[PDB]
């Protein structure tokens, strides 16, 4: 509630706009489950909230719930199935990004879920994999911001120790190789990790597909003022 030298898990606020569709709600529920116990799910059908018009109400709810991150679901004709990620620094919005949920592989949809999988404990730290060349491009501010935000979102509570039994699942965020004239696409996939003996001292890794299969198109970006950003990046 008061500033700490070493902050714990960055608390996450999940809430939605007017007439938010079922897949988005599933996404909000799963994200809520993955960020347990440091997340807050607001079931209000919030209206008049438009982050890129004004982040004020956003900041209000976030600060009132002491959350450093906000995941806001909304949908309209111009921007359907929109997931807005916003970070809060010093009671105000730091940076913000839109991710627009793309349709399914074709004709299965996104199944209704409230958690990632029964084979994965709630609140376990994920292994993270960012694949694609875009994450390595220091001049793509979009992918830099998205990587920073996603790691910030799913890192849970970091520690210098982890049980080998805790290495159960992984999140891959793959950036499609970009083309001129097209908004960047990213893919989020979760996998249960299964290790088989391989003869070597290191086990062979196999994966089992789990949770929702998410495809996003990047929308609007609101960068942070370099003043505010460099103030926020200072580590004690």
């Amino acid at each position: 509630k008061e500033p700490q030298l070493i902050e714990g898990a960055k608390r996450v606020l999940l809430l939605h706009g007017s007439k938010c569709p079922t897949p988005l709600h599933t996404v909000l529920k799963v994200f809520h489950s993955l960020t347990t116990p440091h997340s807050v799910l607001f079931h209000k059908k919030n209206e008049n909230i438009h982050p890129f018009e004004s982040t004020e109400s956003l900041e209000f709810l976030a600060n009132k719930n002491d959350c450093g991150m906000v995941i806001f679901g909304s949908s309209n004709k111009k921007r359907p199935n929109c997931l807005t990620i916003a970070r809060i620094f010093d009671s105000k919005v730091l940076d913000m990004a839109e991710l627009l949920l793309l349709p399914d592989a074709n004709g299965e949809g996104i199944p209704e879920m409230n958690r990632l999988s029964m084979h994965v404990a709630i609140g376990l730290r994920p292994l993270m994999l960012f694949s694609g060349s875009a994450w390595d491009d220091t001049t793509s501010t979009t992918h830099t911001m998205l990587k920073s935000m996603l790691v910030d979102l799913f890192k849970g509570e970091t520690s210098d120790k982890i049980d080998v039994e805790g290495l159960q699942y992984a999140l891959m965020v793959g950036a499609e190789e970009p083309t001129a004239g097209l908004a960047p696409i990213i893919h989020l996939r979760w996998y249960k990790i299964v290790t088989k003996r391989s003869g070597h001292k290191l086990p062979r890794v196999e994966l089992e597909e789990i949770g929702p299969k998410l495809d996003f198109k990047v929308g609007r970006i609101q960068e942070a003022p370099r003043d505010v950003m460099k103030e926020a990046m200072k580590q004690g």
């Binding site: 500033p3 700490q4 030298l5 902050e7 960055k10 450093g68 809060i88 620094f89 010093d90 940076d95 592989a105 730290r125 994920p126 292994l127 993270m128 994999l129 960012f130 694949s131 694609g132 390595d136 920073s148 790691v151 890192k155 970091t158 520690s159 210098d160 120790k161 982890i162 049980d163 080998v164 039994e165 290495l167 992984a170 891959m172 950036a175 499609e176 190789e177 893919h187 996939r189 996998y191 990790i193 290790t195 088989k196 391989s198 003869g199 070597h200 290191l202 086990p203 062979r204 890794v205 994966l207 597909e209 299969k213 942070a224 950003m229 103030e231 990046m233 200072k234 580590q235 004690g236």
Partner: protein, 88 residues
């Protein structure tokens, strides 16, 4: 001795084990002849193989009553704070 635990690619993987994180900077291969989820799963399997290899190989392991624990290096990816550095 018969199934490979090593992945090799033109560009090497990078790591942030403090965040249990690996980067595969190689181009994301999504062949049209194959279903998207299968390609993604293959890439992911390679990457998690690499990440796990790195974790088991380079981290100190401590076995006790508290269990079998990897010691993780401090997170190398710097992330923005929520609240400003406290009043000294």
């Amino acid at each position: 001795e018969r199934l490979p635990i090593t992945v090799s690619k033109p560009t090497p993987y990078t790591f942030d084990l403090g965040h249990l994180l690996a980067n595969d900077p190689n181009p994301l291969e999504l062949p049209k002849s194959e279903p998207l989820n299968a390609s993604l799963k293959a890439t992911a399997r390679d990457g998690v193989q690499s990440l796990l290899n790195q974790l088991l190989t380079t981290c100190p392991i401590t076995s006790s009553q508290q269990g079998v624990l990897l010691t993780l290096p401090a997170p190398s990816t710097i992330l923005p704070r929520h609240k400003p550095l406290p009043t000294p």
